[PDB]
Amino acid sequence: CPEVCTCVPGGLASCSALSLPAVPPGLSLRLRALLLDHNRVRALPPGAFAGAGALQRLDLRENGLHSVHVRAFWGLGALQLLDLSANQLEALAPGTFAPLRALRNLSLAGNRLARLEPAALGALPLLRSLSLQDNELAALAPGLLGRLPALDALHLRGNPWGCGCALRPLCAWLRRHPLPASEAETVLCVWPGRLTLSPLTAFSDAAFSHCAQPLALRDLAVVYTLGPASFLVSLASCLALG
Amino acid sequence: CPEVCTCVPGGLASCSALSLPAVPPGLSLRLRALLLDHNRVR
């Protein structure tokens, strides 16, 4: 008999719309498949669900989440569904999602994240679906794609995202899985022109706008010697012309 | 079928007084003639 809301039979979907800043007081060793829509959580408390070693579904939607903690999920290792819709996140504390490896869908809608740490997210071999609905993310670290081995369902509509090299990892994700051909996902990016606007599906493989390449080994094999090459050529020209 | 409100016949008058800081979640291509009174959008 929890205090905030009554015990729920079957998978115990928790009380939703509890509007709680850190976490609603929960005193039970049986709660499972929790349901936490529209809460005011700003930080996941350490060891919030340590007693419940197993869990299946969590529904943290519409939160004021600005930061998390490493050890909120030490006692949680079986989660498969989790949502992070409509947050105010600033950074993901490393080790928060690291203990979790059974997750299959992780919606991350409406976050205020400028960039995400690949080490903080973890490998997550089972994750395949991830969402960015009404997020403000603009610069996605490619390490997230490097660690995710099965990301094949991406939701992204609604972002102050500007076209450019930051979209190149996401453009690669599109060109390996063309989900946005469906009308539901029609995310956009800012073409360099401030008054202009261009879709993501318009941003094709070529998309010759800016930031061609940061690295080039062909030119790196000669960049070391180009200076001495020019100086020696000028020296030899002076010697020969005299 | 929106989550915050329902699909209103004719002009899709969305529910008002929702108070969501960014925008109420909308997944629809038919919404028109919206009503969005007393929100907390900044």
Side-chain angles (χ1 to χ4, degrees):
Chain A
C1 186
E3 179 257 329
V4 286
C5 253
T6 193
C7 165
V8 188
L12 203 148
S14 212
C15 202
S16 272
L18 268 172
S19 187
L20 256 117
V23 59
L27 298 171
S28 48
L29 201 64
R30 179 64 66 192
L31 74 172
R32 254 168 187 90
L34 303 179
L35 183 63
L36 278 298
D37 297 71
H38 198 291
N39 285 136
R40 200 60 182 169
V41 288
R42 278 90 60 84
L44 272 299
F49 317 86
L55 183 63
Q56 47 266 22
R57 281 196 30 244
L58 185 60
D59 203 320
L60 299 169
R61 262 166 188 146
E62 277 178 338
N63 320 111
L65 183 63
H66 82 278
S67 64
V68 292
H69 213 279
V70 55
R71 53 211 306 191
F73 300 125
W74 287 357
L76 294 87
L79 282 79
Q80 62 181 354
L81 188 153
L82 175 54
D83 194 335
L84 277 296
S85 294
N87 296 115
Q88 276 76 16
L89 190 50
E90 313 272 332
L92 167 61
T96 291
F97 306 139
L100 276 297
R101 266 150 270 168
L103 292 167
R104 194 81 151 160
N105 298 340
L106 170 73
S107 172
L108 195 68
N111 277 29
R112 303 284 86 79
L113 208 67
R115 59 174 84 260
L116 183 62
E117 191 146 300
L121 188 149
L124 263 68
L126 277 296
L127 183 57
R128 54 96 174 176
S129 177
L130 192 151
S131 183
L132 279 298
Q133 306 298 103
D134 206 54
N135 191 317
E136 82 172 13
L137 175 81
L140 192 141
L144 310 173
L145 299 177
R147 296 292 173 86
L148 283 176
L151 192 68
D152 63 81
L154 194 53
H155 275 335
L156 303 148
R157 188 206 41 83
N159 308 307
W161 180 305
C163 304
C165 183
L167 188 63
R168 291 269 100 191
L170 197 150
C171 196
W173 195 97
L174 177 142
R175 75 175 62 99
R176 62 145 165 266
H177 282 82
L179 192 143
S182 50
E183 176 72 5
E185 284 316 304
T186 45
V187 63
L188 296 173
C189 64
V190 173
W191 197 76
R194 289 312 98 186
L195 276 191
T196 62
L197 187 139
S198 178
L200 162 73
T201 185
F203 206 79
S204 302
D205 293 334
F208 174 61
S209 67
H210 278 286
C211 315
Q213 293 177 335
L215 280 168
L217 196 49
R218 260 50 168 176
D219 215 1
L220 188 153
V222 67
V223 65
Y224 275 40
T225 191
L226 181 153
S230 47
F231 274 58
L232 269 295
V233 171
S234 294
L235 191 142
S237 172
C238 293
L239 194 65
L241 188 145
Chain B
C1 189
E3 184 262 328
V4 288
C5 199
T6 195
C7 174
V8 176
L12 278 77
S14 160
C15 298
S16 298
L18 281 169
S19 280
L20 197 153
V23 64
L27 296 174
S28 45
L29 200 66
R30 179 61 65 192
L31 78 173
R32 255 169 186 90
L34 296 176
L35 297 178
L36 299 177
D37 299 71
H38 195 291
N39 291 140
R40 262 275 312 278
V41 291
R42 51 219 170 189

